[PDB]
Amino acid sequence: FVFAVDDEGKTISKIDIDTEAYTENGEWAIDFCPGVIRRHDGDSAGGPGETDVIYSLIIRRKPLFYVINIIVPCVLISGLVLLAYFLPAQAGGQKCTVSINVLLAQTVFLFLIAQKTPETSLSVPLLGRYLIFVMVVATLIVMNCVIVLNVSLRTPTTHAMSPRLRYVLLELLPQL
């Protein structure tokens, strides 16, 4: 195997592309396409060798679909869980409603992503790590809202004021 040559005699060591007639793939952009001729030793030492031509397509994904229909809605929905810190801690404040229904929507996004991600186990996809991250964060904020609602609704008849916790309150007030 040898490579073909152009009108100037230069060796064409790449995939040729008719630049006038080429339509780009809607998801994939070709960045490099080198070509290499490989020669290998035979299956028996001293016997006939083997040769092949390798072309490598270095293709970059255009992520616009995932940005528009997955990532931005997931980021904006996962940002709503921080709004529970401004709702009042009482009946009718809806503190837990926001935080747990954001997780329900995030589970719907898990169903959205399970249809597109590859099913290999050599590595974790970046989208998978982000979804697991925002779900862990939302779980922690559900826990923190539960704790805050527990603290705020302690009736004085059955719950004793801890003096050390009031002391650390008075420590944190001037620190900030």
Partner 1 sequence: DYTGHITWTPPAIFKSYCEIIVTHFPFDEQNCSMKLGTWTYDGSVVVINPESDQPDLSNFMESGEWVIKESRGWKHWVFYACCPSTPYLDITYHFVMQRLPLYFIVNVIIPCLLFSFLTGLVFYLPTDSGEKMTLSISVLLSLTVFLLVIVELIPSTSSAVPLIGKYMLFTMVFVIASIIITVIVINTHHRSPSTHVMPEWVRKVFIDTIPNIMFFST
Partner 2 sequence: TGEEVSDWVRMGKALDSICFWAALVLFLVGSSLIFLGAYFNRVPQLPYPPCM
* Partners of residue 61 on adjacent β-strands: 28
Q: What does 126 interact with, of ligand POV, partner 1, partner 2, none (CB < 5 to 8 A by kind)?
A: partner 2
Q: Does 93 bind partner 1 (CB under 8 A)?
A: yes
- CA dist 127 and 105 (Å) reads 16
Among residues 17, 83, 165, 169, the one that binds partner 1 under rule CB under 8 A: 83
Q: Which is nearer to partner 2, 101 or 144 (CB)?
A: 144
- CA dist 25 and 41 (Å) reads 38
Q: Which is nearer to partner 2, 107 or 154 (CB)?
A: 154
Q: Does 147 bind ligand POV (CB under 6 A)?
A: yes
Q: Which is nearer to ligand POV, 56 or 107 (CB)?
A: 107
Q: Does 19 bind partner 1 (CB under 8 A)?
A: no
> Of 5-13, 50-58, 103-111, 131-139, which part binds ligand POV (CB under 6 A)?
131-139
**Two tokens, residue 53:** 């031509």
- Number of residues assigned to the chain: 176
Q: Strand, helix or coil at 38?
A: strand
- Among 82, 87, 134, smallest CA distance to 108 is for 134
Total residues binding partner 1 (CB under 8 A): 69
Among residues 29, 75, 132, 168, the one that binds ligand POV under rule CB under 6 A: 132
- CA dist 116 and 58 (Å) reads 21
Q: Does 95 bind partner 1 (CB under 8 A)?
A: yes
Q: How far is CA 21 from CA 4, 44, 82, in A?
A: 21, 46, 51
